[PDB]
Amino acid sequence: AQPAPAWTTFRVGLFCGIFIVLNITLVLAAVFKLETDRSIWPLIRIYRGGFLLIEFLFLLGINTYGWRQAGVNHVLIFELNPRSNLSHQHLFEIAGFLGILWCLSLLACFFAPISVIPTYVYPLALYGFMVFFLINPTKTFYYKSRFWLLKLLFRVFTAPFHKVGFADFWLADQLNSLSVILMDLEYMICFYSLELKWDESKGLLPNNSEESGICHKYTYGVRAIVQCIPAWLRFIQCLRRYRDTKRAFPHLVNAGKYSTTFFMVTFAALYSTHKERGHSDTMVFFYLWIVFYIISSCYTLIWDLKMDWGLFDKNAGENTFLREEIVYPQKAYYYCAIIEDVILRFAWTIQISITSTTLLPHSGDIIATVFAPLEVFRRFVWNFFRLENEHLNNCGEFRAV
Amino acid sequence: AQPAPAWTTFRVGLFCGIFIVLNITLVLAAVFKLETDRSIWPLIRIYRGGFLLIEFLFLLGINTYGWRQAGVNHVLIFELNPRSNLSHQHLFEIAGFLGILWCLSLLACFFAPISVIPTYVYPLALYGFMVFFLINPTKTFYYKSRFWLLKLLFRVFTAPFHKVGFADFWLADQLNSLSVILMDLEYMICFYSLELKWDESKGLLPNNSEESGICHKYTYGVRAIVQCIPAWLRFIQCLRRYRDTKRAFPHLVNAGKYSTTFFMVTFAALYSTHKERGHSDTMVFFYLWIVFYIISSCYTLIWDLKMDWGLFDKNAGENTFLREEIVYPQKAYYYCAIIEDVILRFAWTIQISITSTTLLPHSGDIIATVFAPLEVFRRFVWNFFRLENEHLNNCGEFRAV
Ligand SMILES: CCCCCCCCCCCCCCCCCC(=O)OC[C@H](COP(=O)(O)OCCN)OC(=O)CCCCCCCCCCCCCCCCC
Ligand SMILES: CCCCCCCCCCCCCCCCCC(=O)OC[C@H](COP(=O)(O)OCCN)OC(=O)CCCCCCCCCCCCCCCCC
Ligand SMILES: CCCCCCCCCCCCCCCCCC(=O)OC[C@H](COP(=O)(O)OCCN)OC(=O)CCCCCCCCCCCCCCCCC
Ligand SMILES: CCCCCCCCCCCCCCCCCC(=O)OC[C@H](COP(=O)(O)OCCN)OC(=O)CCCCCCCCCCCCCCCCC
Ligand SMILES: CCCCCCCCCCCCCCCCCC(=O)OC[C@H](COP(=O)(O)OCCN)OC(=O)CCCCCCCCCCCCCCCCC
Ligand SMILES: CCCCCCCCCCCCCCCCCC(=O)OC[C@H](COP(=O)(O)OCCN)OC(=O)CCCCCCCCCCCCCCCCC
Ligand SMILES: CC(C)CCC[C@@H](C)[C@H]1CC[C@H]2[C@@H]3CC=C4C[C@@H](O)CC[C@]4(C)[C@H]3CC[C@]12C
Ligand SMILES: CC(C)CCC[C@@H](C)[C@H]1CC[C@H]2[C@@H]3CC=C4C[C@@H](O)CC[C@]4(C)[C@H]3CC[C@]12C
Ligand SMILES: CC(C)CCC[C@@H](C)[C@H]1CC[C@H]2[C@@H]3CC=C4C[C@@H](O)CC[C@]4(C)[C@H]3CC[C@]12C
Ligand SMILES: CC(C)CCC[C@@H](C)[C@H]1CC[C@H]2[C@@H]3CC=C4C[C@@H](O)CC[C@]4(C)[C@H]3CC[C@]12C
Ligand SMILES: CC(C)CCC[C@@H](C)[C@H]1CC[C@H]2[C@@H]3CC=C4C[C@@H](O)CC[C@]4(C)[C@H]3CC[C@]12C
Ligand SMILES: CC(C)CCC[C@@H](C)[C@H]1CC[C@H]2[C@@H]3CC=C4C[C@@H](O)CC[C@]4(C)[C@H]3CC[C@]12C
Ligand SMILES: CC(C)CCC[C@@H](C)[C@H]1CC[C@H]2[C@@H]3CC=C4C[C@@H](O)CC[C@]4(C)[C@H]3CC[C@]12C
Ligand SMILES: CC(C)CCC[C@@H](C)[C@H]1CC[C@H]2[C@@H]3CC=C4C[C@@H](O)CC[C@]4(C)[C@H]3CC[C@]12C
Ligand SMILES: CC(C)CCC[C@@H](C)[C@H]1CC[C@H]2[C@@H]3CC=C4C[C@@H](O)CC[C@]4(C)[C@H]3CC[C@]12C
Ligand SMILES: CC(C)CCC[C@@H](C)[C@H]1CC[C@H]2[C@@H]3CC=C4C[C@@H](O)CC[C@]4(C)[C@H]3CC[C@]12C
Ligand SMILES: CCCCC/C=C/C/C=C\C/C=C/C/C=C/CCCC(=O)O
Ligand SMILES: CCCCC/C=C/C/C=C\C/C=C/C/C=C/CCCC(=O)O
């Protein structure tokens, strides 16, 4: 727990201040300097993934600070080398720098500083730089942590063939909460391949109010696939865990919890096709999808409140509807977090598990865009208590002890 | 030399980043969003004093860092309590915060966010806040250092009646290099009292290209008074030092050095009045002014290079045209600083000691505005070697040892 250098604290302060001013400038430019004849929704859908990644990195820095101060040893749990472990200052600085780049790209999208370069180049340059920064081979910027994250991502995207650790499970869960990023990446790819209108100088902001492009639609059904990998990876990891340990519990229950998302998205997409093609069983599909909903949310919610966090423990005693041992300084944190998980555990499904693979509401874009940050916030608060439960009493039996 | 808290490093980083982004926005607004039918010069003259104060505080933070790392003990020299001495982080943070306020006021002047609030309120608001922050009685923001600076300013503005310390002499010299701030304050007062055009919504940016207002003119001659005040304070302090010690040297020589400014500005204003009224001795007055110039610059320059810094010492030996003892890590610093002092010692005179009390050139405003930051930079570099000389071998005999 060596203190971070004063230079990196200055750097994170600098990046956070630049981010604040650029954000205020971006908000002011959006409200003042804009023209209401073309749909801004493609831009929002392109940049929502980047914004969610920035927010996730910032909240993960907050999580690392909370873990360090509370007492939960995330270094041992994650199986990291104690010498080069990232303090919360480094995560804050990375989040701030990538937020600087995101704000600059969005500003360039709002008004084109250079008339020669087309406005659709900016979203692509931002994510290209993000990928190159993540895949940078030269040992210059956070090389140890970056390479460790690359190994972890490789292991999590090839889940069945690798023995699971806590890092793999944890990153798979984070991906499960970050499905919006994958869906936005798929939307970016489809939009640039079909509907971008490369020739047009303002192609990414088309005039047609009617969204006839199939990119926001789901005719091919690949959108369900790209939305469903984040749960499929966890399902396969749970199956591999059971195959390795030959324990029906708690791995098949978890696999069922993660496979509820399969039926969720399935029936959502079938409802989308059935209603947009004008069939007589659209109401039946909607009712069956609602039926698989509620079970999906309650399954995930009870899992979060009982096994992920360890709360509602019988032997709590003085603590009410909590665990016997608590490491966070204030007991009200758990009580507020339970209500937060309850409220955001029904919202997250409604907003991005659905409503983005089916076009039931017109305001679905607004709901998804406004609730995905609360999805990442729910994941951020879930991280605190899952890691705290891991430190106190081993869950999932990742550790030998 | 206790390290500054990580929170204050984050704060100075935040303020510096906000300052950088606000400065870039200000430059872009000036070059893009402006109207070329009114004189921007009143705004420049109002805000130049604030900018010079921000730059002086930032460069003084740099000076404090250099003093701490080099070895020169500024705490003992200034006679400060070692417990509550300001590290360079605090000076950097104060400079950054006041720069945030200056940038916000300038931005509000460029475009009026509130049509109800007249645009001439913003610089008045900024300078009123600066004064209130300096004279804040509540022990909230840097109360110890602020009250110490208030006592020092009171002592320096009542120079003859107080025994001089190093702090009083040092602040008097800083004022001598910051005469532009006093001149800008006087211009602000005169402009608001006569030429502001309170009724006009854009009074501080008048349409008339011809600057017929007497504020930029010197009919009353009070501008020369407020410009000679910083040198008058040092002259009176040196006279008081001689009266206290009864040593003709080195106090009467210094008093004459500071008195050269009196004749400088005298003959400058006399040339202004003589040329703007059409008399036959304007050339004679110009020649007398220029004659007293060169002597003033060389007097101050030789003083700086011989007694202030202690350079050109006979016993230097291996060091060429330097002193026998040096505490700064690189010897090239002194050699570059000598040339810098010479060039800026002529430049500062020719730019602000004149050309702001007489209207000889039309581009005089540009020259003064572009060279006053070099006057604060020259003072910043002079601070390093004056304090280093004070630490090495007592100059001025402020200390008993
Ligand atoms: C109008 C347009 C929109 C405007 C807003 C745009 C985005 C806003 C983003 C603001 C920036 C947030 C991140 C900046 C916080 C960085 C904190 C930091 O580095 O502080 C240093 C502090 C001291 O460290 P110490 O505890 O001494 O030990 C360190 C061990 N080496 O170390 C610590 O980190 C410990 C103390 C802080 C712990 C984390 C808490 C910081 C985040 C709090 C919430 C931030 C804002 C959230 C949303 C605001 C709106 C509701
Ligand atoms: C160094 C670290 C910190 C970085 C700080 C960056 C600060 C940026 C602050 C932006 C604030 C903008 C302020 C604008 C003031 C008013 C300007 C205006 O109204 O016009 C905008 C101008 C249009 O000009 P025009 O219409 O010809 O003139 C109109 C006459 N009134 O439009 C223009 O031509 C200029 C618009 C300003 C351009 C700002 C954004 C630049 C983006 C550059 C490329 C970004 C892409 C990089 C992607 C990286 C990916 C990793
Ligand atoms: C294709 C779709 C992708 C969807 C999103 C996928 C990425 C999710 C976010 C990345 C994961 C965040 C960090 C995960 C670990 C956090 C826990 C932690 O504190 O780990 C500390 C770890 C220590 O590293 P260290 O000690 O150096 O390693 C051992 C040394 N031999 O150090 C770390 O924390 C390592 C973190 C590495 C640096 C942060 C990530 C860099 C930026 C990522 C940009 C991704 C670009 C995606 C573009 C598409 C967006 C639409
Ligand atoms: C386009 C429009 C205009 C854009 C520009 C607008 C204005 C630019 C202003 C930039 C901000 C400058 C000030 C920020 C520097 C702050 C440095 C800082 O706090 O760093 C922490 C560093 C570490 O401290 P340490 O030595 O470990 O010991 C401390 C003891 N407690 O502690 C230290 O301070 C030591 C290391 C640094 C020492 C001071 C050097 C900093 C200043 C260098 C020059 C800055 C820019 C000058 C002009 C640039 C253009 C030519
Ligand atoms: C919190 C810490 C950090 C603080 C960060 C502050 C961020 C400020 C960033 C400013 C960037 C401005 C970006 C402007 C984008 C383009 C806007 C534009 O072109 O119009 C400006 C707008 C005029 O609007 P209008 O002409 O009606 O509409 C034109 C239609 N295209 O004009 C307007 O009406 C709005 C112009 C923007 C106003 C910015 C400055 C606000 C100043 C508030 C008061 C300041 C005084 C405080 C003094 C304190 C003294 C101690
Ligand atoms: C009317 C025309 C005025 C013209 C300009 C006059 C002001 C010049 C600039 C102010 C002087 C700068 C600082 C001088 C000392 C620097 C040397 C140093 O390092 O001092 C450390 C000192 C320690 O303080 P401490 O230890 O707390 O005191 C003993 C505790 N019992 O701590 C300090 O450094 C104390 C510094 C106090 C905080 C900085 C100043 C606050 C901002 C000043 C705003 C002035 C507003 C002027 C408005 C008009 C502009 C046109
Ligand atoms: C009611 C809902 C919508 C909002 C309330 C939940 C939020 C604000 C709560 C829930 C859990 C809380 C966190 C729980 C534990 C930690 C670690 C501790 O060392 C500092 C506080 C910190 C970082 C808390 C911050 C606030 C927090 C994130
Ligand atoms: C993951 C990060 C890098 C963002 C994804 C951007 C990249 C992979 C995508 C976005 C736009 C895409 C291009 C869009 C259109 C075409 C034209 C088609 O006839 C061949 C493929 C090609 C040339 C695509 C290649 C891949 C591409 C460049
Ligand atoms: C939306 C819902 C209804 C979809 C169906 C998924 C759920 C209900 C199913 C899928 C796989 C199932 C599990 C398969 C195997 C076993 C092992 C046994 O020892 C306990 C029950 C348990 C753990 C089952 C519980 C129910 C389960 C988790
Ligand atoms: C194999 C089990 C464990 C997981 C299944 C998850 C994936 C493969 C499922 C879940 C949702 C499914 C989609 C639901 C709806 C559509 C639209 C329809 O017009 C064609 C099939 C298609 C495109 C399905 C393809 C397969 C799909 C994406
Ligand atoms: C939503 C409903 C209708 C269907 C799915 C919920 C049921 C089948 C499952 C989902 C998660 C399950 C819980 C998961 C973990 C535990 C902890 C264990 O020590 C006691 C049983 C208990 C508390 C399980 C009880 C049954 C449970 C609540
Ligand atoms: C040729 C002219 C115009 C410009 C050159 C002069 C400038 C760049 C030089 C002259 C004196 C120099 C300073 C002298 C001493 C110190 C203290 C040391 O611990 C760090 C470097 C630092 C802070 C130097 C920075 C650069 C400096 C300010
Ligand atoms: C030193 C800091 C506070 C900046 C100086 C600003 C203050 C002191 C100045 C600037 C503008 C000035 C005002 C300008 C005009 C008038 C009208 C006159 O008939 C009476 C004085 C009065 C009302 C002045 C009072 C002093 C004043 C408010
Ligand atoms: C621009 C110039 C010419 C203006 C005149 C000011 C200078 C030259 C004058 C003013 C007062 C003078 C000083 C008055 C008294 C003495 C004391 C004596 O023991 C040594 C000479 C010395 C120290 C004089 C040197 C010259 C002096 C400094
Ligand atoms: C007394 C000695 C030590 C220092 C003298 C410095 C001051 C008081 C001097 C130096 C420059 C002088 C000014 C120079 C020129 C003008 C313009 C003229 O039309 C009237 C006199 C007037 C306004 C002078 C007033 C007094 C003045 C300001
Ligand atoms: C510009 C000219 C024409 C007039 C003013 C310069 C003359 C009179 C003065 C101004 C400053 C003076 C110097 C100030 C300090 C010292 C240090 C001492 O140990 C030797 C003499 C020496 C080096 C002085 C020599 C004379 C000097 C150079
Ligand atoms: C923690 C919560 C964070 C919330 C962050 C919010 C992000 C974006 C918010 C709202 C999205 C609204 C966009 C306005 C656009 C409307 C489309 C109509 C115009 C048209 O059809 O042309
Ligand atoms: C270390 C050096 C720092 C320099 C910082 C620079 C500051 C300001 C620079 C230049 C001032 C130029 C202003 C342009 C205005 C011209 C007046 C003509 C227009 C009119 O008559 O309407």
Swiss-Prot record, chains A, B:
**Description of how the protein assembles with itself and partners:** Homodimer.
Major subcellular location class: membrane
Q: Which UniProt keywords apply?
A: Cell membrane, Disease variant, Membrane, Phosphoprotein, Transmembrane, Transmembrane helix
List cellular component terms (GO).
plasma membrane
> Which ranges does the record list as Extracellular topological domains?
35-39, 113-118, 198-204, 279-281, 361-362
Effect on the protein upon substituting F10G: Decreases phosphate efflux
**What organism, scientifically named, is this protein from?**
Homo sapiens (Human)
**Reactions that this protein is recorded to catalyse:** phosphate(in) = phosphate(out)
Instruction: Supply the name of the protein.
Output: Solute carrier family 53 member 1
Mutagenesis or variant effect for T357C: Decreases phosphate efflux. Decreases phosphate efflux
Detail which positions bind phosphate.
Answer: D173, N176, K257, Y258, R345, R378, R379
Described function: Inorganic ion transporter that mediates phosphate ion export across plasma membrane. Plays a major role in phosphate homeostasis, preventing intracellular phosphate accumulation and possible calcium phosphate precipitation, ultimately preserving calcium signaling. Binds inositol hexakisphosphate (Ins6P) and similar inositol polyphosphates, such as 5-diphospho-inositol pentakisphosphate (5-InsP7), which are important intracellular signaling molecules involved in regulation of phosphate flux.
Q: Where is this site: Gating residue for phosphate transport?
A: W348
One biological process term in Gene Ontology: cellular response to phosphate starvation
**Domain EXS residues, every copy:** 214-401
